[PDB]
Amino acid sequence: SMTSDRLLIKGGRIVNDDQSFYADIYMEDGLIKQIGDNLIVPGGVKTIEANGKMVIPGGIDVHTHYQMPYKGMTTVDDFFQGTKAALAGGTTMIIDHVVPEPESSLTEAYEKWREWADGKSCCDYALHVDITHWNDSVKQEVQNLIKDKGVNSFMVYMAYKDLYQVSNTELYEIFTCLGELGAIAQVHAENGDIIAQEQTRMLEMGITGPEGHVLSRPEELEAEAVFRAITIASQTNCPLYVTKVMSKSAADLISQARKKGNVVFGEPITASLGIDGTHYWSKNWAKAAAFVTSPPLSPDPTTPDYINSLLASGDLQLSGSAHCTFSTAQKAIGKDNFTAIPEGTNGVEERMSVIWDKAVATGKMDENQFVAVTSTNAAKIFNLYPRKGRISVGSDSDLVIWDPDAVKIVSAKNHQSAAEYNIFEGMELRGAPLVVICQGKIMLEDGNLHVTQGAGRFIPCSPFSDYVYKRIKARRKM
Amino acid sequence: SMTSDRLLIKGGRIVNDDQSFYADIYMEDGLIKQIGDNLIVPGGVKTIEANGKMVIPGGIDVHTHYQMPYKGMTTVDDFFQGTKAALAGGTTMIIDHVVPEPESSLTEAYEKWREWADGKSCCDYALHVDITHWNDSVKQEVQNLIKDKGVNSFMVYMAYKDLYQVSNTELYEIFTCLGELGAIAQVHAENGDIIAQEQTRMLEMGITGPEGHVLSRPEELEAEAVFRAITIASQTNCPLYVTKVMSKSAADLISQARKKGNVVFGEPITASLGIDGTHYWSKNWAKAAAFVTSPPLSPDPTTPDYINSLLASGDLQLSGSAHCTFSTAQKAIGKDNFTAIPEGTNGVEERMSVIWDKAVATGKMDENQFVAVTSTNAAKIFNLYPRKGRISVGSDSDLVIWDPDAVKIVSAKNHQSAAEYNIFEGMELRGAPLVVICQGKIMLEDGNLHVTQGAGRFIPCSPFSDYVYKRIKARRKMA
Amino acid sequence: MTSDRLLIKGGRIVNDDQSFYADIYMEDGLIKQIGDNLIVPGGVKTIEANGKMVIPGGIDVHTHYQMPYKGMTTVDDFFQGTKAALAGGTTMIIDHVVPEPESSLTEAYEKWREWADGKSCCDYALHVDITHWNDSVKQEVQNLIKDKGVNSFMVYMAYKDLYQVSNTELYEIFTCLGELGAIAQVHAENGDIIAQEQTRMLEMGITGPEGHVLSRPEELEAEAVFRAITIASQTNCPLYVTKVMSKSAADLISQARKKGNVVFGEPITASLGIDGTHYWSKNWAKAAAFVTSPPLSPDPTTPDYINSLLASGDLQLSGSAHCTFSTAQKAIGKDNFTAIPEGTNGVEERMSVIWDKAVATGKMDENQFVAVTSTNAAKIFNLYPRKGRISVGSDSDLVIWDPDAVKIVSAKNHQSAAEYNIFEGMELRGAPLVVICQGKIMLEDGNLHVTQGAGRFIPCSPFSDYVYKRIKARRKMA
Amino acid sequence: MTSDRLLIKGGRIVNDDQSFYADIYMEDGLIKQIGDNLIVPGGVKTIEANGKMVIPGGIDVHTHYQMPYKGMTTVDDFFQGTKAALAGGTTMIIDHVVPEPESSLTEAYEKWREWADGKSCCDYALHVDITHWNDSVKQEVQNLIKDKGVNSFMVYMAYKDLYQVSNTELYEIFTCLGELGAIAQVHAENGDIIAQEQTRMLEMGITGPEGHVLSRPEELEAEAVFRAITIASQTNCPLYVTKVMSKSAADLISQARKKGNVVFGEPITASLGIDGTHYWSKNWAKAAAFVTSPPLSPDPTTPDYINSLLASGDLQLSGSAHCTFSTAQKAIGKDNFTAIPEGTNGVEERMSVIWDKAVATGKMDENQFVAVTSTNAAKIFNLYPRKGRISVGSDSDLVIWDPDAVKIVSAKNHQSAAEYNIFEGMELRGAPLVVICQGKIMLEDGNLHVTQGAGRFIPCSPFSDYVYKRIKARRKM
Ligand SMILES: [Cl-]
Ligand SMILES: [Cl-]
Ligand SMILES: [Cl-]
Ligand SMILES: [Cl-]
Ligand SMILES: [Mg+2]
Ligand SMILES: [Mg+2]
Ligand SMILES: [Mg+2]
Ligand SMILES: [Mg+2]
Ligand SMILES: [Mg+2]
């Protein structure tokens, strides 16, 4: 790593995913150098007294959309403001989605994302590459991005008919390929064919408000796509990763598949963990539009509690935010037609507090599983353990002094995001970060961010991570 | 109905789906005329003494393929020999599938099926019409078949890519249309896109035998299609009917949907009720080929017991056979490539004994639920109750004197089918018919069939049967 | 016995198997002809149904009229309670004989017969509660079945040190009832754990009615149900779960039936109509009026789900457990929820509640409605087709039902002596217009026409086919 | 002359969280360094691992060495039985203290300590069975937790009129154990209904071993499991289901865990390795050798399924319940299955069975194998990371494991004194090559090198985080 001053944290309760213990932590030049008691260190090292508070690995948000092109527009939180929002909330790494235009080069899109992120990201980051269309030369590009460019994760779309949607035949070809090359097959799993029809029906009945968005994507259509993707991934002996798990029925399909032995992961996001979809019916149009995202927040109010429960039980493994913010003015292009409302909400800053408040303080999971679902499982899946997601000697110095007793109200007044709205507005959350260390530097202290634009490094992610692929390889050899 | 002599059955245990009781039955001119004791009857009426044996409504096999065209060939049991096989096994009505070629007229195919069946069927029958392609004029034909030709059931294919398979958009349009017109939407539910790929893979590894057939259609691909069809049918408020339920996973999806309130039916067949798919690996090639059907018999040997269990519990509702037989010589065209083995097995003659043996004698269901899953549920679904599927005054005189203590070994030597092979060969089955009455005539007595070719009548089936559609209509009336 | 001739014309006859238009001619308690242009004597009283539905009269399989309780008696006796039944479209009731422990079952039965024969407005039958067990009770159970028209007996898993029976006793009882051809009913909650949870709730100063529901969480219904299912399966005895209140309990029955177990579930008007949120009402007397065991679930998703399973056949029939107490009797428990007497209303509202919640919402059709209000009860209890069916030879108990009528339920207007109605203010679609019982018009134009004691006891034979054919075939097997 | 230093080179270290290549240096019972080109003293004994796996030693959480039974004793004592453990790659065992009803728990514990301290070849710990319940037992439970290194106590739902406790007692016991930070274990079968079914089976003339399985159908395991789960949930007490034998029982645990309940399941070698069809063997002695409670399921789909749920984490850890009896002791029950003493072998075969049934079949990887053979047991029983992990500072118990070895299991070749092996003739992929325990080489080249009594008792503190942090948070709402 890059240089950073020496730094010693004393009296912390170190909390990894496997255990908790009291020890001091000595850091230098981006790395954790020693862990233990009465450490022999040079004189005059900057020393932080943790005072029994928790020290956890920094959060890894595996799903972001910073400065994402969308129909001429760009999301309002770019790689600089968006990672300030990440760090403010205890997240020290992000993994964004490269989105090439159909009939455009995957690799050129990747180079373009790299230039944006290398110049702006405050913290370390990596990339998924979205497979928005499929043909032989895309397949060649996929191969090269894995071999040469530090990519191990690719997402296909089952939604967005005539834009990104791929057929069952293409899903089989793609999964077959990604499995052979040791990559993670990600999906955006909703049935675009049926959604397309339901949109038309909803518009025809005169339902043009944001409620038309959630009503034309009932969870049954997420569940169907998830099952179909699970089925095809199983036949092609390819590991599957369901992005943005929003409904109970979808999560149950992942739970059921994992019990059978299928290699399948589920990624709930801050939105589905934090809140429900009743606000699509808000008399305040701009508020309702701010919740518009796909798949949508479920209107079933039992949903968020249930998603936290399955994240706690390991039926879901890791969290993201799918942070994809648009301005009030950009949202308003869809005022008389919900299909023109740009899709996306906030959630990068709030992810870790939401999970602590909903799943730890309610007793569903303990602090160690909290570390697993905020960083360590992401690190293992994406072949970043234990460099990330673990406080141990040799690992990167990304870590957070966490206060389980802190209590904050979430507001757009106070968030790092450029967005005028926050879908978690007015929610009181237990659990918050006090101090954030990233690359061995103090980037959050006493409410203040200390960041340098572009300091973030791209972290290449190798294929065939053991946690995912050893089972796959044993199944092949049979 | 047409003329038949008067006929009296005395001392029977009448077994309907709702109750059992002792009464005599008087029949005349195709109809049941009286039911009760010490019936006042004319002199010289032919009288059959039932001697405490069961009298049940005749079986309705809701899935047959008599003399079906298949790639230049024809199945070997035509409408005449095939309904002799039906009657020999206690089935008095069949419902066959009209299969029009893609891009061809549904109505012309229907007329062709009517001519074949009207001239040959020994017993009453009706028709499903397969929607093998979709466009505006097919939709117009569907409309007319329902209005003018006594059709209320249509099947779509999720399998057979580039032959019959329809897209999700087409599934939605079809289910929307069939639901509006009051028809039953049937599905052949397997994922044809993935099967196509898996066939290619299996051939490339050199697996050309019949095991390649089952290995390229694993139950996962039935289940997926079933779930997708269930999902679309729910969104379009259309009742769904899953034909040939073969696996545990598929039947669980139907079970799960019904519990949520979805109007969904499942049709296991004699094959999935009677036996498993281990025989695809038989060293006798011709035997293995004889089991080749789609979806295939599951290799999981726990499957038949479980399918009977869910038919007993009402998670599955009715039985068919999908009787679709080919000769040894016809099967053999697929000797070097499992994909060219013609698809289909026997099962019309054995359906009722198989269910009795596997579900009634093992205690899973009682005799009354046996009547429901062999006739009465079929009658209610297809809008034929109580003319069929019930012994009561005014109903048709199709009925069977059934012996719950009889025990028969199934063999190709003894079956009515023209096929050289029987997939239930050597199986001992408890429960068998003794006497069969159809149109008020004795068509099976003391082991002998008494049939007239072409005596069968086409039974028109009206749309909007209450059992299926009252719930649908009530749902149409809400937000 | 005698009733005037009576003809109903222009009705839509609705049985559980089909619906059709025909006229109905009745005489001397029996249906005599069904069809069109019926040849009948001159001057027969004629009712024009005008296309409205004619259904078999309701069979409420669970009542507690004038039930002894701690010196007191429920306020609806066999006369007032069956007026309430008939007002709501129910023409038959089946009440529970409750002998004191250590007391004769048969003497209690004779006492119940005298009360009911002298007061019941309509036909009725009896369950006998097995409140203790020993060899002479077993002899009595045998006599009641052979000689006294009883085929249904209930054991208690709740009420420790009062009625609760041990696992050993359950096995003996289920073995015996199964050999003699009877229905084994259960009040299935774990009384041992409830006893402890009561103590705990009192010790946290929770004396209000919320303590009642909070000390009987559904987990304790579910446990008992599973244990009763298990023992009944080992002893090859059919099981009948009374008062199914929770989702978890109904799922255990659903699951058992799918495995082929002979098991029935009896939801009641309360669990079908409403939830348990009202145990937290600041109006103490209102909250106390919901106190019954097992309790109404506080999970508001419960009533919709119970209707769903009744629609799907996972539950088969409905009762009310009508067991009413006065405001003054309820108030005994004002400082201790354990002294609040247990029971609510529901006999009058059962059929409207099910129509409104399950038929008008599209979950079941009218024919399944007849099944769950009369025909399945008749088959289980060996009363088909004398009851639960409009056909020649059956008893003339029937109702002209208006699927379009709309009524608000109030204590002002109910037949019950109780000051409170748990369904107060609820608007219900579906209501009876005319009620015929024993061939006599007992409800017409909002007015009841009853004769005290006109009801007959209906003996119920053992071994009903619907229940026992499967059991017998299993007995015969190796 | 005074020390055991030991270096293992060229191993593939396999922990439950990750795998990597490094050398391992050990001294005086501890792992001292892990890495490459380690600076080490001259003349240190060096073992070349040659790319083979190095895993933490197995922890068998369920044994019954030299257990009393009706005046008799199981034939594998603490010495021979831990030789069998080590031979199969297990370096720690946790046995059950069984006090007689109406007898002191603490006196039974002292007796178990004397037996085991004098004989065990390897480290060990103890569960204490609560075979009866009253105020002074409760006092003893408290003292064993505070002063005697016990954190795990088992109750019985079976054995009516011998050990069985009532629902009220279950509630009291779970309430107490939860407050004191202990693991509540259960032997979960309905003893009331089993007692009846035994009598019925004898009265039909079914006296052979088939009567044993037929009188304990899995329905009765499942019922007891659900009841125990239910009571433990109400009392906010963590529950541990010993000897998970059936699919239905394991589903109940799976279902509870998904709801958030703190519940663990312990399949054993028997339910992981084989089924119950052999209760019908015409060879009586063979059938009797399978007699254990709960019994092996006759449903042959069972062992595959148990492995599947152990792979998915629906079950967490493995034991053997090693409880062996001689042919002669088994034969007491020749005319009555109820007199057949209950127990089978399994300590030696546990790790190879799991590797063969779950790793070689692709259900789980090698790292989850480590979790279900040692690391999850260590975390549950408050022994992580001293046990169940190859890391600096942890105990030097570890195994060089050969994923490619293939062995046939036979009684000819096992360490056990028993004449019968329920896994007789089974071919198993996966075997240990070398076993290190307390830093000493106790297995090399097919030979055991053990010293009787070298084992140490390992005190197990209450409130292990993995189990109790969720419980405490719930207490606090
Ligand atoms: Cl879309
Ligand atoms: Cl196909
Ligand atoms: Cl109680
Ligand atoms: Cl026992
Ligand atoms: Mg940079
Ligand atoms: Mg004809
Ligand atoms: Mg009277
Ligand atoms: Mg009640
Ligand atoms: Mg020692």
Author numbering:
A (entry chain C): 11 to 488
B (entry chain D): 11 to 489
C (entry chain A): 12 to 489
D (entry chain B): 12 to 488
Show passages lifted from the paper.
CRMP-4 is encoded by the gene DPYSL3 (dihydro­pyrimidinase-like protein 3). Like the other CRMPs, it is involved in neuronal development and binds to tubulin dimers and microtubules.
TEV protease removed the N-terminal histidine tag of the CRMP-4 ΔC efficiently. CRMP-4 ΔC crystallized in space group P21. The crystal of CRMP-4 ΔC contains a tetramer in the asymmetric unit. Almost all of the residues are resolved in the electron density. The asymmetric units of CRMP-4 form A and CRMP-4 ΔC each contain four monomers forming a homotetramer with internal 222 symmetry. Using gel-filtration analysis, we identified CRMP-4 to exist as a tetramer in solution and CRMP-4 ΔC to exist as lower oligomers, possibly as monomers and dimers in equilibrium.
